[PDB]
């Protein structure tokens, strides 16, 4: 047991296309080499005691049990270890169904490739499996507590590299949207689309979001300002810093009751809602002033009703929660002694950052709360009426959200969107305190209490009394307005022999459209007419350079079988797909040892043409053309002889075609050919002299004809491109 | 902050 | 006429004060003018503007671009209605959040410009 | 800090001003809306409202201010009299208004001025 | 009158009026009314009654997406077409409503609608 | 802070 090789897959890859995350290991087999499970003995007992969830596992067989039935008739080591790794990163909560493996050309190693949900996780899981079976085939049986270790650092891994539930549900937006998305290495920021078209969100707050409208809606009291002269009907109070203005700053509200709260807390740190005598005043003060950062708090005037949060998104209101407090009802005859543990029982209730609908915890200060209630554990409700437990009203605690979208008046609708475009925020929480939301907050005494930037939405999604909004589309619906994606069009060259001259002619030629251009050649990696940076760069360690830069509208990336093998595609669809030859010159690199599998691997590059685009191929290859079937969208082939019956029958069914037919590199559209240049005043050609150059104009023209690009514009950057 |  | 609200009601308080000390007793104290004149020069201070945002609004004059000053957080607001724009001292209405506070992580811009 | 720029001392002044308003306002463009004031003795209520109606049938935003109270498009912004530039600033500052019909009473002209 | 539909609406298929033309069983009136969903294009919608057996039967042999209307909120078929997909309208509890997929839009209340 |  000796790992040698652990790599890891993000994209379409030569074992599978549309399984991206893959885990790729090479595993020595010394002296387990040719040995079943059956020749092992008591292994099948002990690993079916170990991990006994393996019974659902549907191998080849397609029935319950298959594999363990292929166990018992034996089987390598390597399809045991494969299926232990991918349950063992199943029991931790991450779902994955697809494994294979291989015998590679050397003597002893073999291949295994395992789905992944987690990139660390995956590989632990890998790394895990091996030890595992070592151990069962040592001693017969692996330790629980080891597998319990296991098994938690897997959680751990998964827990850690998680995104947040708003993060997660706009991620998963895109992808139903098909909208392209990555992950930025800074402050947990996703890039969602590509080049020019690209857009930024870090947890709700996206690229366009402004600083000032942040940073005012973070101060209580410049909001208020701004939101009085506006017209808008905050309530009215006053700041006070010291013991000796609280009379003064009472007054100044009009009477009583008031809240206080300070101005430097958030999710209700320290806020007391009613007081109606002085005591009560000066106890909250000081409470206050303790959860006060900077010791300063605020008084206002307190305002009956219920307590609302609107969510505006580009301006439109999108839903509206009333937030309900902790309660119990007692219709049942029960008093809240035994309601409190009756609703910590129901499934809905749980804790941690994913279930909202939080237990309920009843602390010192939830009971001295309901000690204000004027009622005590055994004392039953009254005619079976809501009792509460606390009046923050907030979803952390065990409050309840109720769904009032539809409900809200039009008039209210237009006072919150205005609210949200007055204080500069795209997507905008706003806490309302109303008797009635159906009705305009004018004739009831509705306020605006506060507005809050990046809001969390998992309460408007999951209501548990209305209907879920589907807010993360109206948050897509503002960064992608139409039914545009962040897309741009993205051309890949692969082939044996003339990748790097192809992805400069088709950069040179796209060049002459008034588009910027960034493409990466095995010389480095190009943005317009400027060296970006300097190196092999091939892989998608480069192409990510080129889809992340803001001012890359056309990328052309030249993709080697190396990247490919090591990493897999850097994207997952590309708008021109170009193979223009497969010959087994460097074969036996990696375990790549027939060119029937180096056809395979940079078929990958065709198989991942969209079904829009288009897949250049080489009629003159048979392995290139073989690759017109299993293949999404158009194909368009190019061949140095024009009399390719092939080429030619394809031409008459349909058409876009690239030939050299008398002295001229030709596009043929169906029953119409169109001469680009008599290929001896293209310089790369050496006035015809060099047949490959004539490939590779023929290929670069067809790519960049399938894409609209003007006949002139191609004759014009490919007569002043020249060879370098 | 975070999630307001 | 007046170049600052406060200073220019100061001015004019101080005025008849003056007057009224010189017909009174046929002249004004040093010390009193020196006072005046300092808590001038501090109400001038008070409310000015910074040398960006000054130069920001003289421009804004020049062009002939209406400009107001919001009461929230020393924000210049130019233009009216749907035509307006805000700046604080050199960050405009839209300028990201996103961005400023990847600029103001030196670790983060690093790895990102790398 | 643009303030090494615009005054170097070991070079040529950028107008770095130039450039933020530039950025800020693109064209020829001042940040204005259209402002109609209607003044007179006797008939600025219903001149105000008439006018608000007519720009209403144009697909335009039209905040007013009358008499009775100040207007966003078809619902109250706010009460009371509203006849001076106070309430002229809160149509005026609206990012929603495109256009702006404002009854200047004597009141207000007298009081603060336009 | 037209090669292709955007939108090809069937609202129902009732045996009433049979014997006119060669139509003389509701199989073929039903075969005659889905030539307007049988029409639309691939990137259009038919808009069905899934409450009809024989409208609902209509389902195959249509290019383009399938968009199912009932005023039983608990139709099974409708129910599993937006289980996958969705493009559904119900009458669920006195609303007329859109089912895109698991997210129910509501528009009035049916005792708004005159 | 402000003015950098
Ligand atoms: N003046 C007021 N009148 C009536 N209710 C108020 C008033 N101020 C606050 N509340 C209520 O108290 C809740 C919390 O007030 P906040 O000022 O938002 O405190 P907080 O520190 O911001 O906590 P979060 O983050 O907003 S939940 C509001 O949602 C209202 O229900
Ligand atoms: N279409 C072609 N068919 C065969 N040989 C070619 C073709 N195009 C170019 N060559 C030859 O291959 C050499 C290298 O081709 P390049 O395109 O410059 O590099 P490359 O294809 O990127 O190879 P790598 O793997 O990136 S180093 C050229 O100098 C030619 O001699
Ligand atoms: N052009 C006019 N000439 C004379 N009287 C007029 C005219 N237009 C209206 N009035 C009368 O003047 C009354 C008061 O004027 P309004 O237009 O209603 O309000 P107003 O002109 O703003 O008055 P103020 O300044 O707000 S108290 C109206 O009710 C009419 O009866
Ligand atoms: N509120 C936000 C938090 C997720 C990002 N924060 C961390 N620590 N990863 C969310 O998306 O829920
Ligand atoms: N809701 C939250 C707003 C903080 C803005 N977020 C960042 N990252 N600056 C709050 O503190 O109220
Ligand atoms: N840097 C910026 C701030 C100067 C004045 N600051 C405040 N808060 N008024 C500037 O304008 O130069
Ligand atoms: N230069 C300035 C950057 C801080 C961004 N400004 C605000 N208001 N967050 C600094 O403080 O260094
Ligand atoms: N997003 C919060 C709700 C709140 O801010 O009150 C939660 O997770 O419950
Ligand atoms: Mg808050
Ligand atoms: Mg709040
Ligand atoms: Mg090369
Ligand atoms: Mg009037």
């Given at each position: 047991m000796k790992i040698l090789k652990l790599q890891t897959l993000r994209g379409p890859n030569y074992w599978s296309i549309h399984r991206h995350k893959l885990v790729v290991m090479r595993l020595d087999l010394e002296d387990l080499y040719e040995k079943y499970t059956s020749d092992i003995p008591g292994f099948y007992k002990g690993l079916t005691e170990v991990l006994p969830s393996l019974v659902e596992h549907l191998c080849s067989p397609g029935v319950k049990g298959g594999?363990?039935?292929?166990?018992?008739?034996?089987?390598?080591?390597?399809?045991?270890?494969?299926?232990?790794?991918?349950?063992?990163?199943?029991?931790?909560?991450?779902?994955?169904?697809?494994?294979?493996?291989?015998?590679?050309?050397?003597?002893?190693?073999?291949?295994?490739?395992?789905?992944?949900?987690?990139?660390?996780?995956?590989?632990?899981?890998?790394?895990?499996?091996?030890?595992?079976?070592?151990?069962?085939?040592?001693?017969?049986?692996?330790?629980?507590?080891?597998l319990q270790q296991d098994l938690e650092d897997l959680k751990e891994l998964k827990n850690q590299a998680?995104?947040?539930?708003?993060?997660?549900?706009?991620?998963?937006?895109?992808?139903?949207?098909?909208?392209?998305?990555?992950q930025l290495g800074a402050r947990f920021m996703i890039q969602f689309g590509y080049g020019v078209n690209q857009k930024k969100i870090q947890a709700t707050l996206s690229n366009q979001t402004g600083i000032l409208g942040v940073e005012l809606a973070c101060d209580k009291e410049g909001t208020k300002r701004i939101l009085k002269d506006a017209g808008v009907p905050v309530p009215r109070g006053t700041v006070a810093r010291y013991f000796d203005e609280l009379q003064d700053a009472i007054e100044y509200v009009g009477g009583y009751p008031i809240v206080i709260k300070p101005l430097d807390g958030n999710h209700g740190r320290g806020i007391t809602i009613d007081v109606k005598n002085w005591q009560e005043a000066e106890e909250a003060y000081d409470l206050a002033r303790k959860a006060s950062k900077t010791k300063t708090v605020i008084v206002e005037r307190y305002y009956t009703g219920k307590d609302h949060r609107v969510l505006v998104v580009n301006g439109k209101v999108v839903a509206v929660a009333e937030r309900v407090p902790a309660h119990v009802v007692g219709n049942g005859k029960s008093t809240i002694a035994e309601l409190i543990e009756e609703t910590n029982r129901d499934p809905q209730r749980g804790d941690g950052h994913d279930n909202i609908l939080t237990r309920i915890t009843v602390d010192?200060?939830?009971?001295?709360?309901?000690?204000?209630?004027?009622?005590?554990?055994?004392?039953?409700?009254?005619?079976?009426?809501?009792?509460?437990?606390?009046?923050?009203?907030?979803?952390?605690?065990?409050?309840?959200?109720?769904?009032?979208?539809?409900?809200?008046?039009?008039?209210?609708?237009?006072?919150?969107?205005?609210?949200?475009?007055?204080?500069?925020?795209?997507?905008?929480?706003?806490?309302?305190?109303?008797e009635d939301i159906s009705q305009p907050?004018?004739?009831?005494?509705?306020?605006?209490?506060?507005?809050?930037?990046?809001?969390?939405?998992?309460?408007?999604?999951?209501?548990?009394?209305?209907?879920?909004?589907?807010?993360?589309?109206?948050?897509?619906?503002?960064?992608?307005?139409?039914?545009?994606?962040?897309?741009?069009?993205?051309?890949?060259?692969?082939?044996?022999?003339?990748?790097?001259?192809?992805?400069?002619?088709?950069?040179?030629?796209?060049?002459?459209?008034?588009?910027?251009?960034?493409?990466?050649?095995?010389?480095?990696?190009?943005?317009?007419?400027?060296?970006?940076?300097?190196?092999?760069?091939?892989?998608?360690?480069?192409?990510?350079?080129?889809?992340?830069?803001?001012?890359?509208?056309?990328?052309?990336?030249?993709?080697?079988?190396?990247?490919?093998?090591?990493?897999?595609?850097?994207?997952?669809?590309?708008?021109?797909?170009?193979?223009?030859?497969?010959?087994?010159?460097?074969?036996?690199?990696?375990?790549?040892?027939?060119?029937?599998?180096?056809?395979?691997?940079?078929?990958?590059?065709?198989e991942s043409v969209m079904p829009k685009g288009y897949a250049v191929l080489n009629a003159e290859d048979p392995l290139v053309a073989a690759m017109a079937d299993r293949v999404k969208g158009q194909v368009a082939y190019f061949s140095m002889d024009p009399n390719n019956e092939l080429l030619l029958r394809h031409t008459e069914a349909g058409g876009l075609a690239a030939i050299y037919e008398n002295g001229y590199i030709s596009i043929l559209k169906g029953d119409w050919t169109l001469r680009i240049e008599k290929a001896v005043n293209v310089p790369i050609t050496m006035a015809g002299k060099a047949p490959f150059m004539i490939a590779n104009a023929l290929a670069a023209c067809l790519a960049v004809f399938t894409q609209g690009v003007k006949i002139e514009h191609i004759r014009k950057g490919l007569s002043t491109f020249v060879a370098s | 902050d975070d999630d307001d």
């Open positions: 594999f363990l039935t292929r166990v018992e008739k034996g089987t390598l080591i390597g399809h045991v270890i494969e299926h232990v790794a991918i349950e063992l990163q199943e029991l931790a909560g991450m779902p994955v169904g697809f494994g294979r493996t291989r015998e590679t050309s050397t003597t002893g190693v073999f291949q295994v490739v395992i789905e992944y949900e987690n990139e660390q996780a995956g590989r632990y899981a890998a790394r895990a499996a091996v030890r595992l079976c070592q151990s069962i085939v040592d001693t017969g049986t692996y330790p629980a507590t080891e998680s995104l947040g539930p708003s993060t997660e549900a706009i991620v998963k937006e895109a992808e139903a949207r098909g909208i392209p998305w990555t010192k200060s939830a009971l001295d709360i309901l000690g204000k209630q004027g009622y005590s554990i055994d004392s039953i409700p009254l005619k079976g009426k809501k009792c509460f437990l606390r009046a923050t009203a907030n979803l952390s605690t065990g409050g309840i959200a109720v769904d009032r979208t539809d409900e809200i008046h039009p008039e209210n609708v237009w006072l919150l969107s205005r609210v949200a475009k007055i204080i500069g925020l795209d997507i905008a929480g706003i806490d309302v305190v109303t907050l004018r004739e009831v005494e509705g306020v605006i209490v506060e507005v809050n930037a990046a809001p969390g939405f998992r309460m408007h999604v999951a209501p548990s009394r209305g209907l879920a909004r589907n807010v993360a589309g109206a948050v897509m619906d503002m960064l992608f307005p139409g039914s545009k994606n962040g897309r741009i069009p993205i051309l890949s060259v692969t082939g044996t022999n003339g990748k790097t001259t192809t992805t400069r002619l088709l950069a040179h030629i796209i060049k002459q459209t008034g588009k910027v251009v960034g493409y990466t050649t095995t010389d480095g990696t190009y943005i317009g007419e400027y060296l970006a940076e300097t190196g092999d760069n091939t892989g998608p360690q480069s192409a990510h350079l080129i889809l992340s830069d803001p001012t890359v509208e056309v990328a052309v990336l030249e993709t080697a079988r190396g990247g490919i093998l090591r990493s897999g595609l850097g994207f997952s669809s590309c708008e021109v797909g170009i193979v223009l030859n497969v010959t087994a010159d460097h074969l036996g690199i990696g375990d790549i040892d027939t060119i029937e599998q180096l056809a395979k691997l940079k078929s990958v590059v065709a | -």
